[PDB]
Short mmCIF file of N, CA and C (backbone and C1' of nucleotides) in Angstrom, two decimals:
data_model
loop_
_atom_site.label_atom_id
_atom_site.label_comp_id
_atom_site.label_asym_id
_atom_site.label_seq_id
_atom_site.Cartn_x
_atom_site.Cartn_y
_atom_site.Cartn_z
N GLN A 1 -26.46 -60.08 49.11
CA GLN A 1 -25.40 -59.71 50.03
C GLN A 1 -24.92 -58.29 49.77
N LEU A 2 -23.64 -58.03 50.03
CA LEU A 2 -23.05 -56.72 49.83
C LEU A 2 -22.88 -56.46 48.34
N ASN A 3 -23.45 -55.36 47.86
CA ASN A 3 -23.45 -55.03 46.45
C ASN A 3 -22.18 -54.25 46.12
N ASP A 4 -22.13 -53.65 44.93
CA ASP A 4 -20.96 -52.90 44.49
C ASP A 4 -20.83 -51.61 45.31
N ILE A 5 -19.60 -51.14 45.45
CA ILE A 5 -19.28 -50.11 46.43
C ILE A 5 -18.95 -48.80 45.72
N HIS A 6 -19.31 -47.68 46.37
CA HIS A 6 -19.06 -46.34 45.86
C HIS A 6 -17.58 -45.97 45.98
N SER A 7 -17.28 -44.71 45.66
CA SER A 7 -15.89 -44.26 45.63
C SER A 7 -15.73 -42.91 46.32
N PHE A 8 -14.69 -42.81 47.14
CA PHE A 8 -14.20 -41.57 47.70
C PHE A 8 -13.26 -40.89 46.71
N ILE A 9 -12.94 -39.63 46.98
CA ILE A 9 -11.99 -38.91 46.14
C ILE A 9 -10.58 -39.27 46.59
N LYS A 10 -9.70 -39.53 45.62
CA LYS A 10 -8.29 -39.76 45.87
C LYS A 10 -7.50 -38.78 45.02
N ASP A 11 -6.19 -38.69 45.26
CA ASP A 11 -5.47 -37.67 44.50
C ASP A 11 -5.02 -38.15 43.12
N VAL A 12 -3.97 -38.98 43.06
CA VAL A 12 -3.45 -39.55 41.82
C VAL A 12 -3.07 -41.01 42.01
N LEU A 13 -2.94 -41.45 43.27
CA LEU A 13 -2.39 -42.77 43.57
C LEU A 13 -3.31 -43.61 44.44
N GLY A 14 -4.58 -43.23 44.57
CA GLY A 14 -5.43 -43.86 45.54
C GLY A 14 -5.35 -43.25 46.92
N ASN A 15 -4.57 -42.19 47.09
CA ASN A 15 -4.41 -41.55 48.38
C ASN A 15 -5.52 -40.52 48.58
N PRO A 16 -6.40 -40.69 49.55
CA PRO A 16 -7.60 -39.87 49.63
C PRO A 16 -7.39 -38.61 50.46
N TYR A 17 -8.42 -37.75 50.44
CA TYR A 17 -8.42 -36.51 51.19
C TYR A 17 -9.85 -36.04 51.35
N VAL A 18 -10.10 -35.26 52.40
CA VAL A 18 -11.39 -34.58 52.52
C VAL A 18 -11.31 -33.40 51.56
N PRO A 19 -12.36 -33.12 50.78
CA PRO A 19 -12.26 -32.05 49.78
C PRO A 19 -12.26 -30.68 50.42
N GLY A 20 -11.51 -29.76 49.80
CA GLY A 20 -11.54 -28.39 50.25
C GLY A 20 -12.85 -27.70 49.95
N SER A 21 -13.52 -28.11 48.87
CA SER A 21 -14.79 -27.50 48.51
C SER A 21 -15.88 -27.86 49.52
N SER A 22 -15.86 -29.09 50.02
CA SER A 22 -16.85 -29.49 51.02
C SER A 22 -16.58 -28.84 52.37
N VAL A 23 -15.31 -28.72 52.77
CA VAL A 23 -15.02 -28.06 54.03
C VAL A 23 -15.13 -26.55 53.91
N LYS A 24 -15.21 -26.01 52.69
CA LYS A 24 -15.72 -24.66 52.51
C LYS A 24 -17.24 -24.66 52.52
N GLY A 25 -17.87 -25.69 51.96
CA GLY A 25 -19.31 -25.82 52.04
C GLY A 25 -19.83 -26.28 53.38
N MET A 26 -18.96 -26.81 54.24
CA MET A 26 -19.35 -27.11 55.61
C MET A 26 -19.66 -25.83 56.37
N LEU A 27 -18.74 -24.86 56.30
CA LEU A 27 -18.93 -23.59 57.00
C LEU A 27 -19.94 -22.70 56.30
N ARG A 28 -20.30 -23.01 55.05
CA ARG A 28 -21.45 -22.39 54.42
C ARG A 28 -22.75 -22.81 55.09
N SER A 29 -22.75 -23.96 55.76
CA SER A 29 -23.88 -24.42 56.56
C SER A 29 -23.75 -24.04 58.03
N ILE A 30 -22.95 -23.02 58.35
CA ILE A 30 -22.71 -22.68 59.74
C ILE A 30 -23.10 -21.24 60.04
N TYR A 31 -22.45 -20.27 59.39
CA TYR A 31 -22.52 -18.89 59.86
C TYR A 31 -23.86 -18.24 59.55
N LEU A 32 -24.45 -18.56 58.40
CA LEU A 32 -25.84 -18.19 58.18
C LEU A 32 -26.77 -19.03 59.05
N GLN A 33 -26.39 -20.27 59.30
CA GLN A 33 -27.30 -21.22 59.92
C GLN A 33 -27.44 -21.01 61.42
N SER A 34 -26.40 -20.49 62.07
CA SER A 34 -26.33 -20.52 63.52
C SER A 34 -27.20 -19.43 64.16
N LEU A 35 -26.89 -18.16 63.89
CA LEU A 35 -27.41 -17.05 64.67
C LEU A 35 -28.70 -16.47 64.12
N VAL A 36 -29.54 -17.29 63.48
CA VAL A 36 -30.91 -16.87 63.20
C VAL A 36 -31.72 -16.81 64.49
N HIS A 37 -31.38 -17.65 65.46
CA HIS A 37 -31.96 -17.61 66.81
C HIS A 37 -31.61 -16.30 67.51
N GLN A 38 -37.91 -13.48 64.54
CA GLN A 38 -38.17 -14.90 64.72
C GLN A 38 -37.27 -15.72 63.79
P A B 1 4.01 60.94 -90.23
"O5'" A B 1 3.44 62.19 -91.04
"C5'" A B 1 4.16 62.78 -92.12
"C4'" A B 1 4.38 64.25 -91.88
"C3'" A B 1 3.89 64.72 -90.52
"O3'" A B 1 4.85 65.53 -89.86
"C1'" A B 1 2.73 65.89 -92.26
P C B 2 5.50 64.91 -88.55
"O5'" C B 2 7.05 65.17 -88.71
"C5'" C B 2 7.98 64.28 -88.12
"C4'" C B 2 8.57 64.87 -86.87
"C3'" C B 2 9.45 63.93 -86.05
"O3'" C B 2 10.56 64.65 -85.57
"C1'" C B 2 7.72 64.80 -84.70
P G B 3 11.64 65.23 -86.59
"O5'" G B 3 13.01 65.05 -85.80
"C5'" G B 3 13.85 63.92 -85.98
"C4'" G B 3 13.12 62.63 -85.77
"C3'" G B 3 13.53 61.84 -84.55
"O3'" G B 3 12.46 60.99 -84.17
"C1'" G B 3 14.18 60.68 -86.50
P G B 4 12.32 60.52 -82.64
"O5'" G B 4 10.97 59.69 -82.57
"C5'" G B 4 10.50 58.96 -83.68
"C4'" G B 4 9.35 59.67 -84.34
"C3'" G B 4 8.05 58.90 -84.42
"O3'" G B 4 7.24 59.07 -83.27
"C1'" G B 4 8.63 59.63 -86.56
P A B 5 6.43 57.83 -82.66
"O5'" A B 5 5.86 57.09 -83.94
"C5'" A B 5 4.50 57.23 -84.32
"C4'" A B 5 4.13 56.09 -85.20
"C3'" A B 5 4.21 54.74 -84.55
"O3'" A B 5 3.08 54.43 -83.76
"C1'" A B 5 5.35 54.67 -86.60
P A B 6 3.28 53.60 -82.41
"O5'" A B 6 4.00 52.29 -82.91
"C5'" A B 6 3.89 51.10 -82.19
"C4'" A B 6 4.12 49.93 -83.09
"C3'" A B 6 4.67 48.70 -82.41
"O3'" A B 6 3.65 47.94 -81.80
"C1'" A B 6 5.82 49.11 -84.44
P A B 7 3.43 48.05 -80.23
"O5'" A B 7 4.90 48.32 -79.72
"C5'" A B 7 5.55 47.40 -78.88
"C4'" A B 7 6.06 46.21 -79.64
"C3'" A B 7 6.80 45.23 -78.74
"O3'" A B 7 6.51 43.87 -79.06
"C1'" A B 7 8.26 46.02 -80.44
P C B 8 6.54 42.77 -77.89
"O5'" C B 8 6.76 43.62 -76.56
"C5'" C B 8 8.00 43.58 -75.86
"C4'" C B 8 7.84 43.85 -74.39
"C3'" C B 8 9.17 43.89 -73.68
"O3'" C B 8 9.06 44.56 -72.42
"C1'" C B 8 8.08 41.80 -73.30
P U B 9 10.13 45.70 -72.01
"O5'" U B 9 10.51 45.36 -70.50
"C5'" U B 9 11.86 45.19 -70.09
"C4'" U B 9 12.33 43.79 -70.39
"C3'" U B 9 12.67 42.87 -69.21
"O3'" U B 9 12.07 41.60 -69.43
"C1'" U B 9 14.36 42.80 -70.83
P U B 10 11.67 40.64 -68.22
"O5'" U B 10 11.22 39.31 -68.96
"C5'" U B 10 10.16 39.33 -69.89
"C4'" U B 10 10.38 38.30 -70.95
"C3'" U B 10 10.70 36.91 -70.46
"O3'" U B 10 9.56 36.18 -70.03
"C1'" U B 10 12.14 37.49 -72.23
P A B 11 9.74 35.03 -68.94
"O5'" A B 11 10.37 33.82 -69.74
"C5'" A B 11 9.64 33.16 -70.74
"C4'" A B 11 10.47 32.13 -71.45
"C3'" A B 11 11.05 31.03 -70.58
"O3'" A B 11 10.11 30.03 -70.28
"C1'" A B 11 12.68 31.82 -72.12
P A B 12 9.60 29.82 -68.77
"O5'" A B 12 10.93 29.71 -67.95
"C5'" A B 12 11.20 28.54 -67.23
"C4'" A B 12 12.13 27.64 -67.99
"C3'" A B 12 13.04 26.82 -67.12
"O3'" A B 12 12.40 25.68 -66.59
"C1'" A B 12 14.25 27.72 -68.93
P A B 13 12.25 25.54 -65.01
"O5'" A B 13 13.74 25.37 -64.51
"C5'" A B 13 14.59 24.34 -65.02
"C4'" A B 13 15.83 24.17 -64.17
"C3'" A B 13 15.62 24.36 -62.67
"O3'" A B 13 16.38 23.40 -61.94
"C1'" A B 13 17.34 25.79 -63.43
P A B 14 15.70 22.60 -60.73
"O5'" A B 14 15.74 23.61 -59.50
"C5'" A B 14 14.60 24.38 -59.13
"C4'" A B 14 14.30 24.32 -57.64
"C3'" A B 14 15.38 24.86 -56.71
"O3'" A B 14 14.76 25.40 -55.55
"C1'" A B 14 14.98 22.60 -56.21
P C B 15 14.93 26.96 -55.21
"O5'" C B 15 16.36 27.07 -54.54
"C5'" C B 15 16.53 27.35 -53.15
"C4'" C B 15 17.43 26.34 -52.49
"C3'" C B 15 17.33 26.23 -50.97
"O3'" C B 15 17.29 24.86 -50.59
"C1'" C B 15 19.58 26.47 -51.63
P C B 16 15.95 24.26 -49.97
"O5'" C B 16 15.99 22.76 -50.46
"C5'" C B 16 17.04 21.92 -50.05
"C4'" C B 16 17.77 21.33 -51.22
"C3'" C B 16 18.61 20.13 -50.89
"O3'" C B 16 17.85 18.95 -50.79
"C1'" C B 16 19.86 21.60 -52.23
P G B 17 17.93 18.06 -49.47
"O5'" G B 17 19.34 17.35 -49.56
"C5'" G B 17 19.50 16.25 -50.43
"C4'" G B 17 20.95 15.90 -50.63
"C3'" G B 17 21.69 15.37 -49.43
"O3'" G B 17 21.36 14.03 -49.13
"C1'" G B 17 23.06 16.86 -50.64
P U B 18 21.51 13.50 -47.63
"O5'" U B 18 23.07 13.33 -47.46
"C5'" U B 18 23.62 12.10 -47.08
"C4'" U B 18 24.86 12.30 -46.27
"C3'" U B 18 24.62 12.41 -44.78
"O3'" U B 18 24.49 11.17 -44.13
"C1'" U B 18 25.95 14.21 -45.49
P G B 19 23.24 10.95 -43.16
"O5'" G B 19 23.62 11.82 -41.89
"C5'" G B 19 24.84 11.57 -41.21
"C4'" G B 19 25.04 12.44 -40.00
"C3'" G B 19 23.90 12.44 -38.98
"O3'" G B 19 24.46 12.45 -37.67
"C1'" G B 19 24.42 14.64 -39.58
P U B 20 24.51 11.11 -36.80
"O5'" U B 20 23.08 11.07 -36.12
"C5'" U B 20 22.52 12.25 -35.54
"C4'" U B 20 21.18 11.95 -34.95
"C3'" U B 20 20.81 12.81 -33.76
"O3'" U B 20 19.39 12.87 -33.65
"C1'" U B 20 21.11 10.58 -33.06
P U B 21 18.69 14.23 -33.22
"O5'" U B 21 18.42 14.06 -31.67
"C5'" U B 21 18.55 15.16 -30.79
"C4'" U B 21 19.49 14.84 -29.67
"C3'" U B 21 18.84 14.61 -28.32
"O3'" U B 21 19.68 13.73 -27.59
"C1'" U B 21 20.36 16.35 -28.14
P G B 22 19.13 12.35 -27.03
"O5'" G B 22 20.46 11.54 -26.75
"C5'" G B 22 20.91 10.59 -27.69
"C4'" G B 22 22.41 10.44 -27.70
"C3'" G B 22 23.10 10.13 -26.39
"O3'" G B 22 22.94 8.80 -25.93
"C1'" G B 22 24.32 11.77 -27.53
P C B 23 22.76 8.53 -24.36
"O5'" C B 23 24.24 8.21 -23.86
"C5'" C B 23 25.14 7.47 -24.67
"C4'" C B 23 26.57 7.80 -24.33
"C3'" C B 23 26.95 7.64 -22.87
"O3'" C B 23 27.19 6.30 -22.50
"C1'" C B 23 27.77 9.70 -23.66
P A B 24 26.36 5.65 -21.29
"O5'" A B 24 27.33 5.80 -20.05
"C5'" A B 24 27.36 7.02 -19.34
"C4'" A B 24 28.56 7.10 -18.45
"C3'" A B 24 28.25 6.90 -16.98
"O3'" A B 24 28.33 5.54 -16.63
"C1'" A B 24 29.51 8.87 -17.28
P C B 25 27.20 4.89 -15.71
"O5'" C B 25 27.09 5.86 -14.47
"C5'" C B 25 25.95 5.79 -13.64
"C4'" C B 25 26.01 6.79 -12.53
"C3'" C B 25 24.77 6.80 -11.65
"O3'" C B 25 25.13 7.11 -10.31
"C1'" C B 25 25.04 8.91 -12.66
P U B 26 25.18 5.94 -9.22
"O5'" U B 26 23.80 5.17 -9.39
"C5'" U B 26 22.59 5.76 -8.94
"C4'" U B 26 21.52 4.73 -8.68
"C3'" U B 26 20.37 5.22 -7.83
"O3'" U B 26 19.20 4.46 -8.12
"C1'" U B 26 21.49 3.51 -6.69
P G B 27 18.17 4.96 -9.24
"O5'" G B 27 16.82 5.15 -8.44
"C5'" G B 27 16.55 6.38 -7.81
"C4'" G B 27 16.98 6.38 -6.37
"C3'" G B 27 16.19 5.42 -5.49
"O3'" G B 27 17.02 5.03 -4.40
"C1'" G B 27 15.83 7.61 -4.76
P C B 28 16.75 3.65 -3.62
"O5'" C B 28 17.83 3.66 -2.45
"C5'" C B 28 19.17 3.26 -2.68
"C4'" C B 28 20.13 4.18 -1.98
"C3'" C B 28 20.09 4.14 -0.47
"O3'" C B 28 20.80 3.06 0.10
"C1'" C B 28 20.07 6.38 -1.19
P A B 29 20.38 2.51 1.55
"O5'" A B 29 21.01 3.57 2.56
"C5'" A B 29 22.40 3.62 2.82
"C4'" A B 29 22.70 4.60 3.93
"C3'" A B 29 21.90 4.41 5.20
"O3'" A B 29 22.42 3.41 6.05
"C1'" A B 29 21.85 6.68 4.57
P A B 30 21.44 2.55 6.99
"O5'" A B 30 20.99 3.57 8.12
"C5'" A B 30 21.49 3.47 9.44
"C4'" A B 30 20.80 4.45 10.34
"C3'" A B 30 19.45 4.03 10.87
"O3'" A B 30 19.55 3.30 12.08
"C1'" A B 30 19.35 6.25 10.02
P C B 31 19.67 1.70 12.09
"O5'" C B 31 18.42 1.25 12.95
"C5'" C B 31 17.14 1.70 12.60
"C4'" C B 31 16.62 2.70 13.59
"C3'" C B 31 15.34 2.28 14.28
"O3'" C B 31 15.30 2.86 15.58
"C1'" C B 31 14.95 4.24 13.05
P C B 32 14.53 2.09 16.77
"O5'" C B 32 14.05 0.73 16.10
"C5'" C B 32 12.67 0.41 15.97
"C4'" C B 32 12.47 -1.08 15.82
"C3'" C B 32 11.03 -1.54 15.63
"O3'" C B 32 11.04 -2.75 14.88
"C1'" C B 32 11.88 -2.43 17.64
P C B 33 9.95 -3.01 13.73
"O5'" C B 33 8.63 -3.39 14.54
"C5'" C B 33 7.40 -2.74 14.28
"C4'" C B 33 6.74 -2.38 15.58
"C3'" C B 33 6.01 -3.51 16.31
"O3'" C B 33 6.32 -3.42 17.69
"C1'" C B 33 4.63 -1.64 16.16
P G B 34 6.29 -4.72 18.63
"O5'" G B 34 6.91 -4.18 20.00
"C5'" G B 34 8.22 -3.65 20.02
"C4'" G B 34 8.30 -2.44 20.91
"C3'" G B 34 7.68 -2.62 22.28
"O3'" G B 34 8.54 -3.30 23.17
"C1'" G B 34 6.95 -0.59 21.35
P G B 35 7.94 -4.05 24.45
"O5'" G B 35 7.84 -2.90 25.54
"C5'" G B 35 6.62 -2.65 26.20
"C4'" G B 35 6.49 -1.21 26.58
"C3'" G B 35 5.70 -0.94 27.84
"O3'" G B 35 6.48 -1.09 29.01
"C1'" G B 35 4.94 0.47 26.13
P A B 36 6.13 -2.22 30.08
"O5'" A B 36 4.55 -2.15 30.23
"C5'" A B 36 3.86 -3.03 31.11
"C4'" A B 36 3.02 -2.26 32.09
"C3'" A B 36 1.75 -2.93 32.57
"O3'" A B 36 1.97 -3.86 33.62
"C1'" A B 36 1.28 -0.69 31.97
P A B 37 1.03 -5.15 33.81
"O5'" A B 37 -0.36 -4.59 34.34
"C5'" A B 37 -1.47 -4.44 33.45
"C4'" A B 37 -2.79 -4.73 34.10
"C3'" A B 37 -3.18 -6.20 34.09
"O3'" A B 37 -4.03 -6.49 35.20
"C1'" A B 37 -4.64 -4.97 32.66
P U B 38 -3.42 -7.22 36.49
"O5'" U B 38 -4.22 -8.59 36.60
"C5'" U B 38 -4.74 -9.24 35.45
"C4'" U B 38 -4.59 -10.73 35.53
"C3'" U B 38 -5.78 -11.53 35.01
"O3'" U B 38 -5.34 -12.79 34.51
"C1'" U B 38 -5.49 -11.96 37.31
P U B 39 -4.88 -12.97 32.97
"O5'" U B 39 -6.07 -13.76 32.28
"C5'" U B 39 -6.31 -15.13 32.57
"C4'" U B 39 -7.35 -15.27 33.64
"C3'" U B 39 -7.67 -16.68 34.13
"O3'" U B 39 -7.95 -16.57 35.52
"C1'" U B 39 -9.64 -15.65 33.38
P C B 40 -7.83 -17.82 36.51
"O5'" C B 40 -9.10 -17.67 37.44
"C5'" C B 40 -10.24 -16.94 37.03
"C4'" C B 40 -10.23 -15.52 37.56
"C3'" C B 40 -10.99 -15.29 38.86
"O3'" C B 40 -10.16 -15.51 40.00
"C1'" C B 40 -11.64 -13.68 37.23
P U B 41 -10.71 -15.34 41.50
"O5'" U B 41 -12.22 -15.84 41.43
"C5'" U B 41 -12.94 -16.12 42.62
"C4'" U B 41 -13.66 -14.90 43.12
"C3'" U B 41 -15.06 -15.13 43.66
"O3'" U B 41 -15.07 -15.53 45.01
"C1'" U B 41 -15.09 -13.34 42.11
P U B 42 -16.16 -16.61 45.52
"O5'" U B 42 -17.56 -15.91 45.24
"C5'" U B 42 -18.37 -15.45 46.31
"C4'" U B 42 -19.73 -16.09 46.28
"C3'" U B 42 -19.73 -17.61 46.23
"O3'" U B 42 -19.57 -18.21 47.50
"C1'" U B 42 -21.19 -16.76 44.57
P G B 43 -18.56 -19.45 47.70
"O5'" G B 43 -19.43 -20.71 47.29
"C5'" G B 43 -20.76 -20.87 47.78
"C4'" G B 43 -21.57 -21.84 46.95
"C3'" G B 43 -21.03 -23.27 46.91
"O3'" G B 43 -22.12 -24.19 46.91
"C1'" G B 43 -21.18 -22.42 44.71
P C B 44 -22.23 -25.33 48.03
"O5'" C B 44 -20.73 -25.81 48.27
"C5'" C B 44 -20.17 -26.85 47.47
"C4'" C B 44 -19.55 -27.94 48.31
"C3'" C B 44 -19.78 -29.36 47.80
"O3'" C B 44 -18.67 -30.18 48.13
"C1'" C B 44 -20.74 -29.14 49.94
P A B 45 -18.17 -31.30 47.08
"O5'" A B 45 -19.16 -32.52 47.31
"C5'" A B 45 -19.72 -33.24 46.21
"C4'" A B 45 -21.11 -33.74 46.52
"C3'" A B 45 -21.19 -35.09 47.23
"O3'" A B 45 -22.24 -35.07 48.19
"C1'" A B 45 -22.44 -35.17 45.24
P C B 46 -22.13 -35.97 49.51
"O5'" C B 46 -23.64 -36.35 49.83
"C5'" C B 46 -24.44 -35.46 50.60
"C4'" C B 46 -25.55 -34.87 49.78
"C3'" C B 46 -26.85 -35.64 49.77
"O3'" C B 46 -27.61 -35.45 50.95
"C1'" C B 46 -26.33 -34.93 47.57
P G B 47 -27.55 -36.53 52.14
"O5'" G B 47 -29.02 -36.49 52.74
"C5'" G B 47 -30.12 -37.02 52.01
"C4'" G B 47 -30.92 -35.93 51.34
"C3'" G B 47 -32.41 -36.20 51.24
"O3'" G B 47 -33.11 -35.90 52.43
"C1'" G B 47 -31.59 -35.43 49.15
P U B 48 -33.66 -37.09 53.37
"O5'" U B 48 -34.06 -38.24 52.35
"C5'" U B 48 -35.37 -38.32 51.81
"C4'" U B 48 -35.56 -39.58 51.01
"C3'" U B 48 -35.27 -40.88 51.74
"O3'" U B 48 -36.32 -41.29 52.60
"C1'" U B 48 -34.27 -40.94 49.60
P C B 49 -36.01 -41.66 54.13
"O5'" C B 49 -36.00 -43.25 54.16
"C5'" C B 49 -37.15 -44.00 53.76
"C4'" C B 49 -36.91 -45.50 53.82
"C3'" C B 49 -36.37 -46.05 55.13
"O3'" C B 49 -36.99 -47.30 55.42
"C1'" C B 49 -34.94 -46.68 53.35
P G B 50 -37.42 -47.67 56.92
"O5'" G B 50 -38.92 -48.18 56.79
"C5'" G B 50 -39.25 -49.55 57.05
"C4'" G B 50 -40.74 -49.76 57.19
"C3'" G B 50 -41.18 -51.23 57.19
"O3'" G B 50 -42.33 -51.38 58.02
"C1'" G B 50 -42.18 -50.11 55.36
#
RNA sequence: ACGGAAACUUAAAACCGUGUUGCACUGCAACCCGGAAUUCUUGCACGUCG
């Protein structure tokens, strides 16, 4: 059946957030990635 | 055979004995080891499922 479950990042109380490093790394996959269009 | 001829001015004896170049006196009074320098800038927990 359903096995053991992974973990998201939380702050100090179980309250989660999207990381700032990933949303900085999100746009690292954008501005170089977009306008290469040999 | 010259008032002539002989003779030491000589022998010993400590310029010694008592006596501090000594007594009173800060190598002391005043000062900062003190002022100006980002532990920083590049960095996604993810590729992987008959």
